[PDB]
Design a protein around this motif. Structure first.
Motif, PDB file in Angstrom:
ATOM      1  N   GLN A   1      71.450 -64.242 -89.558  1.00  0.00           N
ATOM      2  CA  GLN A   1      71.027 -65.374 -90.367  1.00  0.00           C
ATOM      3  C   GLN A   1      71.475 -66.710 -89.799  1.00  0.00           C
ATOM      4  O   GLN A   1      70.890 -67.740 -90.149  1.00  0.00           O
ATOM      5  CB  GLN A   1      71.564 -65.225 -91.794  1.00  0.00           C
ATOM      6  CG  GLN A   1      70.502 -65.400 -92.853  1.00  0.00           C
ATOM      7  CD  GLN A   1      70.879 -64.759 -94.167  1.00  0.00           C
ATOM      8  OE1 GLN A   1      71.549 -63.727 -94.204  1.00  0.00           O
ATOM      9  NE2 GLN A   1      70.445 -65.373 -95.262  1.00  0.00           N
TER      10      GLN A   1
ATOM     11  N   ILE B   1      66.677 -65.118 -89.439  1.00  0.00           N
ATOM     12  CA  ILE B   1      67.398 -66.325 -89.055  1.00  0.00           C
ATOM     13  C   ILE B   1      66.948 -67.507 -89.908  1.00  0.00           C
ATOM     14  O   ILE B   1      65.753 -67.687 -90.185  1.00  0.00           O
ATOM     15  CB  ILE B   1      67.211 -66.618 -87.556  1.00  0.00           C
ATOM     16  CG1 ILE B   1      68.366 -67.489 -87.059  1.00  0.00           C
ATOM     17  CG2 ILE B   1      65.874 -67.297 -87.294  1.00  0.00           C
ATOM     18  CD1 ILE B   1      68.617 -67.378 -85.581  1.00  0.00           C
ATOM     19  N   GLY B   2      67.916 -68.319 -90.331  1.00  0.00           N
ATOM     20  CA  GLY B   2      67.639 -69.522 -91.092  1.00  0.00           C
ATOM     21  C   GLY B   2      68.167 -70.762 -90.401  1.00  0.00           C
ATOM     22  O   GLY B   2      67.667 -71.869 -90.620  1.00  0.00           O
TER      23      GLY B   2
ATOM     24  N   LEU C   1      69.232 -72.005 -86.474  1.00  0.00           N
ATOM     25  CA  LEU C   1      69.268 -71.756 -85.036  1.00  0.00           C
ATOM     26  C   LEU C   1      69.624 -73.060 -84.341  1.00  0.00           C
ATOM     27  O   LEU C   1      68.897 -74.049 -84.469  1.00  0.00           O
ATOM     28  CB  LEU C   1      67.925 -71.214 -84.530  1.00  0.00           C
ATOM     29  CG  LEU C   1      67.868 -70.876 -83.038  1.00  0.00           C
ATOM     30  CD1 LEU C   1      68.904 -69.822 -82.666  1.00  0.00           C
ATOM     31  CD2 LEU C   1      66.476 -70.407 -82.624  1.00  0.00           C
TER      32      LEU C   1
ATOM     33  N   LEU D   1      58.841 -68.201 -82.189  1.00  0.00           N
ATOM     34  CA  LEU D   1      59.668 -68.937 -83.135  1.00  0.00           C
ATOM     35  C   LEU D   1      58.867 -69.310 -84.376  1.00  0.00           C
ATOM     36  O   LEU D   1      59.433 -69.435 -85.467  1.00  0.00           O
ATOM     37  CB  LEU D   1      60.251 -70.185 -82.475  1.00  0.00           C
ATOM     38  CG  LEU D   1      61.194 -69.963 -81.288  1.00  0.00           C
ATOM     39  CD1 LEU D   1      61.681 -71.302 -80.738  1.00  0.00           C
ATOM     40  CD2 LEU D   1      62.380 -69.088 -81.664  1.00  0.00           C
TER      41      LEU D   1
ATOM     42  N   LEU E   1      59.058 -66.883 -87.518  1.00  0.00           N
ATOM     43  CA  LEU E   1      60.311 -66.755 -88.259  1.00  0.00           C
ATOM     44  C   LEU E   1      60.129 -67.454 -89.601  1.00  0.00           C
ATOM     45  O   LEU E   1      60.239 -68.679 -89.698  1.00  0.00           O
ATOM     46  CB  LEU E   1      61.459 -67.353 -87.458  1.00  0.00           C
ATOM     47  CG  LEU E   1      61.742 -66.709 -86.098  1.00  0.00           C
ATOM     48  CD1 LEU E   1      62.856 -67.466 -85.387  1.00  0.00           C
ATOM     49  CD2 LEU E   1      62.095 -65.241 -86.266  1.00  0.00           C
TER      50      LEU E   1
ATOM     51  N   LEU F   1      63.220 -69.694 -90.829  1.00  0.00           N
ATOM     52  CA  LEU F   1      63.867 -70.659 -89.945  1.00  0.00           C
ATOM     53  C   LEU F   1      63.751 -72.044 -90.566  1.00  0.00           C
ATOM     54  O   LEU F   1      62.694 -72.678 -90.503  1.00  0.00           O
ATOM     55  CB  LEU F   1      63.233 -70.627 -88.562  1.00  0.00           C
ATOM     56  CG  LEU F   1      63.705 -71.722 -87.604  1.00  0.00           C
ATOM     57  CD1 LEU F   1      65.217 -71.660 -87.425  1.00  0.00           C
ATOM     58  CD2 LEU F   1      62.997 -71.609 -86.262  1.00  0.00           C
ATOM     59  N   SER F   2      64.849 -72.527 -91.156  1.00  0.00           N
ATOM     60  CA  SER F   2      64.871 -73.806 -91.852  1.00  0.00           C
ATOM     61  C   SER F   2      65.753 -74.853 -91.185  1.00  0.00           C
ATOM     62  O   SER F   2      65.785 -76.000 -91.644  1.00  0.00           O
ATOM     63  CB  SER F   2      65.341 -73.611 -93.297  1.00  0.00           C
ATOM     64  OG  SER F   2      66.706 -73.220 -93.349  1.00  0.00           O
ATOM     65  N   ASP F   3      66.474 -74.502 -90.124  1.00  0.00           N
ATOM     66  CA  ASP F   3      67.388 -75.449 -89.483  1.00  0.00           C
ATOM     67  C   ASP F   3      67.388 -75.123 -87.990  1.00  0.00           C
ATOM     68  O   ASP F   3      68.123 -74.245 -87.532  1.00  0.00           O
ATOM     69  CB  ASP F   3      68.777 -75.365 -90.090  1.00  0.00           C
ATOM     70  CG  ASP F   3      69.744 -76.335 -89.463  1.00  0.00           C
ATOM     71  OD1 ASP F   3      69.319 -77.145 -88.613  1.00  0.00           O
ATOM     72  OD2 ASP F   3      70.936 -76.275 -89.825  1.00  0.00           O
ATOM     73  N   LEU F   4      66.536 -75.825 -87.252  1.00  0.00           N
ATOM     74  CA  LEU F   4      66.419 -75.682 -85.812  1.00  0.00           C
ATOM     75  C   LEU F   4      66.952 -76.934 -85.133  1.00  0.00           C
ATOM     76  O   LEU F   4      66.828 -78.047 -85.652  1.00  0.00           O
ATOM     77  CB  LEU F   4      64.963 -75.448 -85.397  1.00  0.00           C
ATOM     78  CG  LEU F   4      64.719 -75.208 -83.907  1.00  0.00           C
ATOM     79  CD1 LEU F   4      65.207 -73.837 -83.467  1.00  0.00           C
ATOM     80  CD2 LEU F   4      63.242 -75.375 -83.588  1.00  0.00           C
TER      81      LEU F   4
ATOM     82  N   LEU G   1      58.066 -75.285 -87.573  1.00  0.00           N
ATOM     83  CA  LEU G   1      58.568 -76.087 -86.462  1.00  0.00           C
ATOM     84  C   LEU G   1      57.978 -77.492 -86.455  1.00  0.00           C
ATOM     85  O   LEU G   1      58.692 -78.465 -86.184  1.00  0.00           O
ATOM     86  CB  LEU G   1      58.271 -75.389 -85.137  1.00  0.00           C
ATOM     87  CG  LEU G   1      59.353 -74.405 -84.698  1.00  0.00           C
ATOM     88  CD1 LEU G   1      59.173 -73.064 -85.373  1.00  0.00           C
ATOM     89  CD2 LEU G   1      59.355 -74.256 -83.188  1.00  0.00           C
TER      90      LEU G   1
END
Ligand SMILES: *[C@@H]1O[C@H](CO)[C@@H](O[C@@H]2O[C@H](CO)[C@@H](O[C@@H]3O[C@H](CO[C@H]4O[C@H](CO[C@H]5O[C@H](CO)[C@@H](O)[C@H](O)[C@@H]5O[C@H]5O[C@H](CO)[C@@H](O)[C@H](O)[C@@H]5O)[C@@H](O)[C@H](O[C@H]5O[C@H](CO)[C@@H](O)[C@H](O)[C@@H]5O[C@H]5O[C@H](CO)[C@@H](O)[C@H](O)[C@@H]5O)[C@@H]4O)[C@@H](O)[C@H](O[C@H]4O[C@H](CO)[C@@H](O)[C@H](O)[C@@H]4O[C@H]4O[C@H](CO)[C@@H](O)[C@H](O)[C@@H]4O[C@H]4O[C@H](CO)[C@@H](O)[C@H](O)[C@@H]4O)[C@@H]3O)[C@H](O)[C@H]2NC(C)=O)[C@H](O)[C@H]1NC(C)=O
Ligand SMILES: *[C@@H]1O[C@H](CO)[C@@H](O[C@@H]2O[C@H](CO)[C@@H](O[C@@H]3O[C@H](CO[C@H]4O[C@H](CO[C@H]5O[C@H](CO)[C@@H](O)[C@H](O)[C@@H]5O[C@H]5O[C@H](CO)[C@@H](O)[C@H](O)[C@@H]5O)[C@@H](O)[C@H](O[C@H]5O[C@H](CO)[C@@H](O)[C@H](O)[C@@H]5O[C@H]5O[C@H](CO)[C@@H](O)[C@H](O)[C@@H]5O)[C@@H]4O)[C@@H](O)[C@H](O[C@H]4O[C@H](CO)[C@@H](O)[C@H](O)[C@@H]4O[C@H]4O[C@H](CO)[C@@H](O)[C@H](O)[C@@H]4O[C@H]4O[C@H](CO)[C@@H](O)[C@H](O)[C@@H]4O)[C@@H]3O)[C@H](O)[C@H]2NC(C)=O)[C@H](O)[C@H]1NC(C)=O
Ligand SMILES: CC(C)[C@H](C)[C@@H](O)[C@H](O)[C@@H](C)[C@H]1CC[C@H]2[C@@H]3COC(=O)[C@H]4C[C@H](O)[C@H](O)C[C@]4(C)[C@H]3CC[C@]12C
Ligand SMILES: CC(C)[C@H](C)[C@@H](O)[C@H](O)[C@@H](C)[C@H]1CC[C@H]2[C@@H]3COC(=O)[C@H]4C[C@H](O)[C@H](O)C[C@]4(C)[C@H]3CC[C@]12C
Ligand SMILES: *[C@@H]1O[C@H](CO)[C@@H](O[C@@H]2O[C@H](CO)[C@@H](O)[C@H](O)[C@H]2NC(C)=O)[C@H](O)[C@H]1NC(C)=O
Ligand SMILES: *[C@@H]1O[C@H](CO)[C@@H](O[C@@H]2O[C@H](CO)[C@@H](O)[C@H](O)[C@H]2NC(C)=O)[C@H](O)[C@H]1NC(C)=O
Ligand SMILES: *[C@@H]1O[C@H](CO)[C@@H](O[C@@H]2O[C@H](CO)[C@@H](O)[C@H](O)[C@H]2NC(C)=O)[C@H](O)[C@H]1NC(C)=O
Ligand SMILES: *[C@@H]1O[C@H](CO)[C@@H](O[C@@H]2O[C@H](CO)[C@@H](O)[C@H](O)[C@H]2NC(C)=O)[C@H](O)[C@H]1NC(C)=O
Ligand SMILES: *[C@@H]1O[C@H](CO)[C@@H](O[C@@H]2O[C@H](CO)[C@@H](O)[C@H](O)[C@H]2NC(C)=O)[C@H](O)[C@H]1NC(C)=O
Ligand SMILES: *[C@@H]1O[C@H](CO)[C@@H](O[C@@H]2O[C@H](CO)[C@@H](O)[C@H](O)[C@H]2NC(C)=O)[C@H](O)[C@H]1NC(C)=O
Ligand SMILES: *[C@@H]1O[C@H](CO)[C@@H](O[C@@H]2O[C@H](CO)[C@@H](O)[C@H](O)[C@H]2NC(C)=O)[C@H](O)[C@H]1NC(C)=O
Ligand SMILES: *[C@@H]1O[C@H](CO)[C@@H](O)[C@H](O)[C@H]1NC(C)=O
Ligand SMILES: *[C@@H]1O[C@H](CO)[C@@H](O)[C@H](O)[C@H]1NC(C)=O
Ligand SMILES: *[C@@H]1O[C@H](CO)[C@@H](O)[C@H](O)[C@H]1NC(C)=O
Ligand SMILES: *[C@@H]1O[C@H](CO)[C@@H](O)[C@H](O)[C@H]1NC(C)=O
Ligand SMILES: *[C@@H]1O[C@H](CO)[C@@H](O)[C@H](O)[C@H]1NC(C)=O
Lengths: 721, 727
Positions: free
Chosen positions: A630, A653-654, A656, A671, A674, A677-680, A697
């Motif tokens: 995560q 994953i939330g 990365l 990507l 995902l 995925l809220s924090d790249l 993204l």
């Protein structure tokens, strides 16, 4: 309808999976579970803990004329169809752990099954309102357990009173029934000794008058409801001169603790008044509770020296919980007169002075096993006298004003398992003789101290270890390869130190490691591909069920680390909101709860922060196969190569963070697949090419992609122009 | 015999001195009718109905029978004189209705049995403040229908109270005062009777015992003040519905008995009416029960000197609207001072001394939405830390701040030195720093008391001290003061105690100290003073008047290590402090052998006094000892040891008759020891060692009794205890 031909009809019609092959070999009396009689008839069927999956209807088994014992607990039976209409001879029925939803099964057993002595419907999914009591023609039923189901709405005014007068044990816990408690009739309630309405939604400022008719009550459990007002006093508790256990915890009671409650002290063994808003103190009247063993008054607003003027005189106390109160001053020395004290919890109070240790220097060896005084203002040093408490398993002195060294006598306690003393100013190091001359620890939680030195290779001897936290100390040296022998280690925090050397490859042998935080050290070398070598194989373990708090650093990459996990037993949240470690980042949030795995088997690592080091080389392809991962923070290193396309496998994953490296190439398209995925953040690399169009993204701020070498596409200027 | 003649025999037989000529008008001449006579009052028909000679400095022997012979005498006020007791007579047909014989020297209690048996119309009789001795036995006659108030207090009555003493009074009784004696008895055995009109009862200050209250006492449904303080009552305070019997009670005192256990929550049954409660001086434990939230009329609550603890200051006391005087000293209350105590917007006096408090001094009482009425803040002998809050400057009504014996640090803000009403600034035994401003008692209050000893104060004592004309007691000992003793001290004509020992003061001992008319305690030891002993220190000898320093709590730790110990002892202000905290104070063990005296400041002379304590040791004073020093008749300690004095010990020192400590050691004194020292009957501590003395040691008094070490290192002293002079 022969008995042998009924059970076969049961196996085929009801059971749909028997992976244990414990229903095979199905004469009547020779079949597994079925206990027969001499004249050839079946009298009982015991299939407990068989892992059976099927649909149940009791009429298909009560058709057996001589069946008097049915044990189907610990299986996975569902509710069946109404089917047939037969008599019931059952005297003992157990359906404890299943998935029954149709409460008409309880109507049948209560209408038929007239010789029934005991029935357990607990831990199922039985739904609906409580309607019918056991038949009045039944004169034998003593114990009925409907606890932990999904029963709803009000309770019939005469539901309890309508029970046969032979009832002894009635358990209604773990549902969501409602209603003004005062309007519920117990009737004559003769012979009733055990009653629980715990964990429901009962209200009212009064008890029903009929409750006083239960002269033989031994357990009264009314916890986790919404009872309000003052605890009844005066003469009320004289009605119950056999009561051994009383619980009124986690209601809305206020005021002081009635001195008149001491009319149970001839017999009272267990008391739980915790989780209310009670003030004052334990009345002096309780010195007569010569039989009291467990006294729980936590999470109230109690204050005063009643610990010395009252509690110390309870000669048989063994479990004393007063955490989360307003008790100030020294821990009274007189408390050691409690010769039989095994568990003492005084956390989250206003205690000052020195750590109590007198318990260990009695005229008899101390049986004290748990000492918990976290979130107080204890000062001085960890007293060497605690080494004489040879039965100690858990020491929790965290969030105090302790100073100085950790004496050698602590690391030599033979049965120590939990050493919890984070959030002090403790100095010194970790001895090389841990867990070999002392106990094989499960938790070593000393983060936020001033500890020096390195982590001994002798840590390899702590095979039972579940959780090591040494973050925010002054540690140095290399991470010992011996950590690899800890195949039950689940959480490892060593961030904000000055560790050097490589991240050992031996970490891959930690079969259960789910949480690895090494941020803000001085580590070098390559990323070991072996870190993911347990992906898809991780099993849960005994780290579940522990109080924790998580401090999320909401400041992005500027803030060091992705966040902070802390053991949080016995600590108020407010004490953490003002810990300057929190304010280290301008934006923070406090997640809180109990540690809980989100998988049953075949899991992976959950949290991985290696940020702010000097790790070089390429991201191992295997890292992307961690399906429950995560958080993955590799920011601020010297990583090279490309971002592996395997990262499309990081389903969970939330967060990365790969920022501040020397990564090249394209952002993997996967990507975009995902969904969480809220924090790249890939800023400050040599990345190029289009920004994946999928997922979330295209919406991340420009700050998350900046300082690269040719990224294009929303949120950046389009690639085609 | 005619009323005019009866009064005549009173002035002759009884009166023996009339220093004011109060009774000069009593002559048979112009209008011989006795109604012109002073203190006499007649009815229209010309007969006397009253004699009032109150506070008239009359001295003589009283026999009431010579006055009660007046057929129409209904009032007799002789209180406030010096009437002793004569020999009683069988009787003389009495008809008195009001009798006041307070504040006299009456001894024979037979006057009480007379007035109680005859005088069947008495409504009020006051025998208080006499020396009436003996057992109580007789109650007013059963024929007396009228008596309401009886005051027998502050006498010398003794032994058991009759079980039915109170019950045998007429049923019209409303006020009965028995305090201030030493009567004994089990209180449960005492019958109050039907108690149908009694409203004020007191047995306080006696030796009464028992572990129960009498059942009879619950019949006093109309009681309004009940005072049983200072007795030997044991057990638990009565509970259950007992206090429901007193639905009009306003003032209850059970202070200074032997009560134990908790405060009964059912004591709250008074809280519609209770205005004043005093349970101080017992062994009560626990908290003030929650049921006291309903005491909206409670003005004075005193629970001092018990074993109370908890958070009841916040959960109960803060919700009392009208609390004006709150006393909780000498208890076990830990934690911080509850901030919610500020919700008491009428609090005038707060005493929280001798508990286990931690944290900062309250900074909230003053910064409220109205004029703070707080007058006294007393938090001595706790564990408070930090600086003195500047916020106290907003408490413009403060008259007394006592923060002594804490762990406070930093400077005293000038917002303290400018409180316009400030009178007592008591903060000794801390670690405060900085100095006394130069603008003291000008912008701020004209202080009575400046007590900052055992601190880290620096700098000099400003001359503006001369503006604190109200000053009574200055104590800055064991600080880091430098500079000179300002001559302006001579303007402080109320100053009684000046302690400056253990600093680095230089200069002279100002002769202006001789204008301090009330100076009785001067301590300058262990400084750097020089010059000559000013002879003016004795100029007030035989003229000192007592003052308002009297009545304050003190403690004197006597150093029993000889002259080798610095100074002759430590006098410290001791309000709100436990003696145990002083036994562990390092000043207390700087000298190996010590003993702690304690009490309340008391003068031993009413006029024409002298100085009492003069310690000037461990300086560099030179010159001769002024002869006038020997004329200080109340001087009890005189320590001039460890200086550079020269010359002879005055023969005047034979006039130091009250002296007990006399240390002249380690000087350059010469000559003979005056033989008149032999006439000092109380001299118990003498040291003249390490001087130039020679010749015989006097033979009278105690001078032959002291150890050898007290005459040693002189130049040829001889005589017992030394070798004889004749050998
Ligand atoms: C009445 O009734 C009732 C019912 O209704 C009951 O109660 C119960 O009880 C029981 C007892 O036992 C319990 O159980 C236990 O528990 C524990 C934990 O605890 C804690 O927690 C919990 C939970 O919580 C949660 O939930 C809730 C609700 O439910 C809420 O509220 C909260 O908040 C939480 O939540 C959270 O979480 C969750 C999950 O995750 C989620 O979902 C959410 O969201 C959130 O997050 C609880 O419950 C509890 O409580 C309690 O306590 C408290 C404090 O104290 C109080 O206040 C309360 O009231 C209660 O009380 C109780 O208790 C106490 C003490 O504590 C006392 O005093 C009283 O009296 C009572 O009793 C808490 O808080 C755990 O830990 C456990 O576990 C264990 O066991 C098991 C079996 O059983 C197993 O399986 C496991 O594993 C474990 O084991 C252990 O131990 C054993 C022995 O025992 C052994 O064998 C093993 O091995 C282990 O061991 C250990 O140690 C060792 C060394 O030695 C080592 O090696 C190892 O490793 C380990 O460590 C149990 O489970 C339950 O819970 C309850 N329930 C309720 C509902 O409440 C009662 O009892 C009655 N009463 C009477 C009087 O009778
Ligand atoms: C019941 O009954 C009883 C009878 O018996 C009573 O009692 C009483 O009371 C009163 C009051 O009211 C008192 O009187 C006062 O006092 C004070 C002092 O005080 C303190 O002290 C004391 C004494 O002590 C001693 O003694 C004892 C016995 O006797 C003992 O025990 C002790 O220990 C001591 O002894 C010591 O000393 C002595 C002498 O020297 C010797 O002899 C010996 O040996 C030793 O050494 C006492 O008593 C007291 O006590 C109290 O307090 C405590 C604490 O708090 C407690 O515990 C107790 O109980 C008591 O209490 C009471 O009080 C309180 C308060 O505090 C309250 O709360 C309660 O409630 C009660 O009440 C103490 O400790 C003094 O101060 C005073 O004097 C004053 O006044 C007078 C008149 O009034 C005058 O003359 C003077 O001068 C003064 O004056 C002042 O004030 C005023 C007003 O008031 C004014 O006007 C003036 O000006 C002045 O002022 C001041 O201030 C200002 C500012 O503000 C300035 O400017 C100026 O300058 C000044 O400074 C008085 O005297 C008494 O004493 C008592 N008694 C007995 C016996 O106790 C009661 O009250 C009743 N109750 C009811 C309720 O009713
Ligand atoms: C098994 C234990 C060791 C563990 C504490 C566990 O019980 C707990 O539920 C863990 C997995 C939680 C507690 C706090 C959670 C994080 C809280 O912080 C966050 O800001 C959120 C933001 C966003 O929702 C991310 O998707 C997840 C993320 C970043 C969470 C990821 C999962 C956690 C780390
Ligand atoms: C009026 C105040 C300033 C003063 C404190 C006063 O009330 C108090 O009574 C004074 C005078 C007393 C308190 C303690 C007394 C002393 C008690 O301790 C002593 O050392 C004895 C020793 C010896 O008995 C001396 O003769 C008297 C001497 C040295 C006493 C001298 C007088 C005192 C100093
Ligand atoms: C209990 O037995 C009854 C009676 O045999 C079962 O009901 C039959 O189920 C079969 C299979 O679905 C149907 O074809 C029949 O029509 C049903 N009724 C009959 C035969 O009368 C019932 O299924 C059994 N209980 C369970 C849970 O399987
Ligand atoms: C690592 O831990 C140290 C512990 O000392 C932190 O240093 C603190 O930094 C704060 C900044 O607000 C100061 O107020 C403290 O005084 C520092 N502590 C000491 C003991 O001096 C440091 O910030 C931590 N780093 C991270 C990234 O969490
Ligand atoms: C889930 O985990 C299990 C258990 O580890 C894996 O299956 C077995 O693994 C063991 C070794 O622990 C082998 O000896 C068995 O032969 C495996 N049995 C199989 C594969 O049926 C299993 O591979 C994991 N499943 C995944 C990763 O999908
Ligand atoms: C108050 O009266 C007493 C007598 O009761 C006076 O005491 C006498 O005083 C003189 C000297 O003035 C002595 O000669 C007597 O012996 C004393 N008598 C007793 C019995 O001691 C006392 O002086 C008077 N006080 C005054 C007037 O202030
Ligand atoms: C006792 O003191 C009084 C006054 O306190 C003295 O009497 C008068 O004192 C004033 C000064 O206040 C002088 O001016 C008068 O001359 C004194 N009058 C006389 C002596 O009659 C009194 O002298 C003192 N008694 C002594 C010292 O024994
Ligand atoms: C003057 O006061 C000072 C206050 O600091 C005294 O110094 C301390 O005295 C105590 C006495 O028990 C010693 O324990 C401390 O060590 C002293 N502190 C220092 C820094 O020296 C001093 O003794 C006093 N002087 C006299 C003569 O009494
Ligand atoms: C007695 O005093 C004299 C002085 O008064 C001491 O003898 C001489 O003192 C003078 C100073 O006045 C010094 O200059 C001399 O040196 C002293 N002579 C000697 C031989 O020391 C004498 O010592 C004193 N004796 C005692 C015991 O104090
Ligand atoms: C497993 O069997 C045991 C022994 O009969 C029984 O006590 C237990 O409840 C069973 N476990 C379940 C039903 O989960
Ligand atoms: C260490 O001591 C300092 C002293 O100021 C204190 O502020 C700090 O909180 C202590 N450390 C911890 C982790 O509590
Ligand atoms: C990648 O980027 C770095 C720094 O951004 C730069 O120095 C380097 O030359 C680049 N390398 C390539 C394009 O191979
Ligand atoms: C002085 O006279 C007044 C007025 O009667 C009286 O109340 C007072 O008690 C007298 N003073 C005494 C007796 O000391
Ligand atoms: C005393 O009380 C009785 C009964 O109430 C009453 O008759 C009598 O008048 C009262 N006496 C006075 C003086 O009030």
């Amino acid at each position: 309808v022969n008995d042998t031909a009924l059970l076969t009809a049961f196996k085929q019609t009801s059971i749909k999976s028997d992976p244990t092959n414990f229903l095979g070999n199905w004469d009547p009396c020779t079949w597994r579970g079925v206990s027969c009689s001499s004249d050839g008839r079946v009298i009982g069927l015991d299939l407990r803990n068989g892992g059976l999956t099927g649909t149940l209807n009791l009429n298909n088994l009560t058709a057996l004329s001589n069946l008097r014992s049915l044990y189907l607990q610990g299986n996975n039976f569902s509710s069946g169809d109404s089917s047939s209409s037969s008599g019931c001879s059952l005297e003992v029925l157990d359906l404890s752990s299943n998935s029954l939803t149709d409460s008409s099964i309880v109507d049948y057993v209560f209408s038929t099954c007239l010789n029934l002595v005991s029935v357990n419907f607990s831990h199922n999914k039985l739904a609906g309102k409580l309607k019918s009591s056991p038949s009045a023609s039944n004169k034998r039923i003593t114990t009925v357990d409907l606890s932990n189901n999904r029963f709803s709405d009000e309770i019939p005014e005469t539901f309890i009173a309508d029970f046969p007068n032979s009832l002894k044990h009635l358990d209604l816990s773990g549902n969501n029934v409602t209603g003004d408690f005062s309007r519920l009739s117990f009737g004559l309630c003769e012979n009733l000794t055990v009653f629980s309405l715990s964990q429901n939604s009962i209200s009212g400022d009064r008890f029903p008058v009929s409750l006083s008719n239960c002269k033989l009550l031994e357990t009264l459990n009314l916890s986790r409801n919404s009872l309000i007002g003052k605890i009844p006093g005066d003469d009320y508790w004289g009605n119950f001169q056999n009561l051994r256990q009383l619980s009124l915890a986690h209601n809305l009671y206020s005021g002081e603790i009635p001195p008149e409650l001491s009319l149970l002290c001839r017999t009272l063994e267990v008391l739980d008044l915790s989780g209310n808003s009670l003030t004052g103190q334990l009345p002096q009247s309780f010195t007569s509770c010569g039989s009291l063993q467990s006294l729980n008054l936590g999470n109230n607003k109690l204050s005063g020296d009643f610990l010395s003027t009252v509690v110390s005189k309870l000669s048989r106390i063994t479990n004393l919980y007063l955490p989360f109160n307003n008790i100030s001053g020294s821990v009274p020395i007189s408390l050691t007169n409690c010769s039989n004290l095994r568990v003492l919890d005084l956390s989250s109070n206003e205690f000052t002075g020195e750590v109590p240790s007198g318990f260990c220097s009695l005229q008899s060896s101390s049986v004290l096993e748990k000492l918990l005084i976290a979130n107080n203002y204890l000062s001085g040093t960890v007293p060497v006298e605690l080494g004489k408490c040879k039965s100690l398993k858990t020491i929790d002195l965290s969030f105090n004003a302790l100073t100085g060294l950790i004496p050698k006598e602590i690391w030599t306690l033979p049965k120590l398992s939990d050493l919890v003393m984070w959030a002090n100013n403790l100095t010194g190091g970790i001895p090389e003789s841990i867990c070999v001359d002392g106990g094989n620890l499960e938790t070593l939680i000393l983060n936020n101290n001033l500890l020096t030195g390195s982590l001994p290779e002798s840590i390899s001897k702590c095979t039972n270890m579940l959780w090591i936290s040494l973050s925010s100390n002054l540690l140095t040296g290399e991470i010992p390869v011996g950590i690899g022998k800890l195949e039950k280690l689940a959480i490892l925090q060593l961030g904000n130190n000055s560790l050097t050397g490589n991240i050992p490859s031996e970490l891959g042998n930690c079969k259960n490691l789910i949480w690895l935080d090494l941020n803000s050290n001085n580590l070098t070398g390559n990323l070991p591909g072996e870190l993911a070598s347990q992906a898809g194989l991780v099993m849960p373990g005994s780290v579940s069920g522990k109080q924790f708090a998580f401090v999320r650093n909401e400041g992005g990459t500027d803030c060091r680390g992705a966040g902070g996990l802390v053991e949080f037993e016995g600590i108020r949240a407010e004490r953490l909101e003002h810990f300057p470690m929190v304010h280290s980042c301008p934006k923070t949030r406090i997640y809180s709860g109990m540690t809980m795995y989100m998988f049953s088997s075949n899991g992976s690592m959950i949290y991985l922060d290696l940020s702010y080091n000097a790790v070089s080389g390429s991201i191992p392809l295997g890292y992307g196969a961690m399906g429950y991962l995560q958080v993955l923070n590799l920011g601020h290193n010297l990583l090279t190569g490309t971002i592996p396309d395997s990262f499309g496998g990081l389903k969970a994953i939330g967060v990365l963070d790969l920022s501040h490296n020397d990564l090249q190439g394209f952002l993997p398209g996967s990507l975009g697949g995902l969904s969480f995925l809220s924090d790249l953040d890939v800023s400050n690399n040599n990345l190029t090419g289009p920004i994946p169009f999928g997922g979330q993204l295209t919406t991340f701020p420009l700050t998350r992609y900046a300082n690269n070498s040719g990224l294009c596409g929303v949120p950046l200027p389009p690639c085609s122009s």
